[PDB]
Amino acid sequence: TFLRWASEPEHDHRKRMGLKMLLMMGLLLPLTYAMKRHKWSVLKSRKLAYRPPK
Amino acid sequence: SVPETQVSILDNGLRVASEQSSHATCTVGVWIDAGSRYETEKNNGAGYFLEHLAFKGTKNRPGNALEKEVESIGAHLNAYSTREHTAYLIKALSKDLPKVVELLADIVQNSSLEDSQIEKERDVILREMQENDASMQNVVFDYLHATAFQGTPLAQAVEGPSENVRRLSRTDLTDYLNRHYKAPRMVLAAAGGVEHQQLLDLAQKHLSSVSRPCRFTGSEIRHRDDALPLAHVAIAVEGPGWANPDNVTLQVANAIIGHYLCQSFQTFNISYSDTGLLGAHFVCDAMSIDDMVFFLQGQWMRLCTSATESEVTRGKNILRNALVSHLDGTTPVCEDIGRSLLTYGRRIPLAEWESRIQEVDAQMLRDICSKYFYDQCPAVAGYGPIEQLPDYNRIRSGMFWLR
Numbered sequence: 135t136f137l138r139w140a141s142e143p144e145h146d147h148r149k150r151m152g153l154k155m156l157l158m159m160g161l162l163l164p165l166t167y168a169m170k171r172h173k174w175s176v177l178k179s180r181k182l183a184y185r186p187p188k
Numbered sequence: 189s190v191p192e193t194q195v196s197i198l199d200n201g202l203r204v205a206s207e208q209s210s211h212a213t214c215t216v217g218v219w220i221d222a223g224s225r226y227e228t229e230k231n232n233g234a235g236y237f238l239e240h241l242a243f244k245g246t247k248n249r250p251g252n253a254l255e256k257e258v259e260s261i262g263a264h265l266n267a268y269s270t271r272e273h274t275a276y277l278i279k280a281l282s283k284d285l286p287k288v289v290e291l292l293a294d295i296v297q298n299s300s301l302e303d304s305q306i307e308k309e310r311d312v313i314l315r316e317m318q319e320n321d322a323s324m325q326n327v328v329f330d331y332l333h334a335t336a337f338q339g340t341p342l343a344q345a346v347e348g349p350s351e352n353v354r355r356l357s358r359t360d361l362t363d364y365l366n367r368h369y370k371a372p373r374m375v376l377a378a379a380g381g382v383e384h385q386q387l388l389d390l391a392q393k394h395l396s397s398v399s400r401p402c403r404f405t406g407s408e409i410r411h412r413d414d415a416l417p418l419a420h421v422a423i424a425v426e427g428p429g430w431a432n433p434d435n436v437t438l439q440v441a442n443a444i445i446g447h448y449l450c451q452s453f454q455t456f457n458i459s460y461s462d463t464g465l466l467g468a469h470f471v472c473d474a475m476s477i478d479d480m481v482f483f484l485q486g487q488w489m490r491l492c493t494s495a496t497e498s499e500v501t502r503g504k505n506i507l508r509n510a511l512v513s514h515l516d517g518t519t520p521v522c523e524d525i526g527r528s529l530l531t532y533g534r535r536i537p538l539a540e541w542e543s544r545i546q547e548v549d550a551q552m553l554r555d556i557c558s559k560y561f562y563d564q565c566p567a568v569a570g571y572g573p574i575e576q577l578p579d580y581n582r583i584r585s586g587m588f589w590l591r
Contacts, residue, residue: 176408176580
């Protein structure tokens with residue numbers, strides 16, 4: 135355990151950063167996905183129709 | 189001291205209004221609260237096709253002998269149909285006032301729809317529609333109505349789809365006639381050299397027999413046809429309606445907007461019963477398309493944010509000078525009178541219009557413009573080479589400013 139600590143004194147600090155990163159990404163990924171799906175809904179609902187004058 | 193429009197509704201419900209003027213020529217019309225908004229997609233061209241059939245003879249005056257009568261006094265006979273109102277009006281002399289009223293009585297009741305004529309007027313209507321497509325601005329405004337009022341009876345056109353036109357019969361027409369021609373929904377309007385008591389007596393003599401959720405939708409419709417030389421684009425937002433007074437303020441704003449870039453700018457405030465379309469219909473070359481827009485949207489946001497007193501005063505003067513719409517001419521006034529009684533239920537005098545104009549200042553103009561233009565979803569209708577016409581996100585983002 136000590137040698138491990140030696141080889142990475144920041145082990146603890148990092149894991150705290152990783153926990154904050156997972157919480158922030160769990161907050162931010164569905165919200166950015168919702169913004170993308172808002173701004174892409176317009177097209178994803180676009181209905182095309184071909185009306186040759188005939 | 190505006191000449192008052194004396195009104196005399198009948199027990200049947202026929203409001204009879206008239207305004208007297210020096211003109212020895214008088215215009216008399218019948219307004220009916222019946223348009224394409226009252227049609228239920230199975231009779232989508234009934235009002236238009238009845239408007240074609242209404243001058244082709246009645247029971248008492250069979251065929252062209254009827255129009256021979258309106259040639260005999262030298263009178264002019266006109267009719268029109270909108271999405272909410274139908275009008276049958278005659279411009280004549282003053283001394284021919286009784287017979288004209290009698291003629292109008294036949295046109296609203298006792299009318300005769302000949303089966304022979306029905307086929308002939310179907311070919312007329314069909315052909316006109318088959319060539320109506322030629323008029324672009326009509327195509328663009330119909331597209332704007334369709335995409336703004338999808339799923340409602342306000343999307344469907346006055347003419348209707350060729351389908352219905354072909355598939356229509358006397359009985360159907362008879363229904364529309366017998367259903368939407370009720371006496372309480374009718375105004376007999378007269379303007380010019382007419383006496384109100386004589387007109388009331390004539391309405392009592394004839395015409396005394398007449399029987400007794402609107403939603404806007406923001407959507408991008410784009411009819412691309414690159415062979416056309418010019419492009420017509422209309423952008424609108426939801427209007428307030430007939431009875432909402434800030435229409436007056438919006439009219440001033442429309443005035444202030446005026447028309448400054450690519451040619452063919454314009455502005456409209458079309459009003460229906462508690463709804464409407466307020467916007468602009470420009471028409472232009474491939475490149476100007478966007479900028480004009482960009483241009484146009486900037487002006488709207490300026491009216492939402494930075495309206496000054498000088499342009500408000502200019503718009504008020506332009507609107508007042510626009511009261512000339514009322515003017516004194518028999519036809520225009522009569523027409524105005526016709527709507528007044530159908531929409532407001534009364535004739536608003538020009539002094540009340542002047543009071544509502546002079547109470548408008550810059551602060552309430554930018555307040556009402558922010559209420560109706562800022563951060564609103566518009567309806568867009570384009571026809572022609574409209575590839576450089578921006579799609580809905582760019583127009584929607586141009587409907588507000590980040591500053």
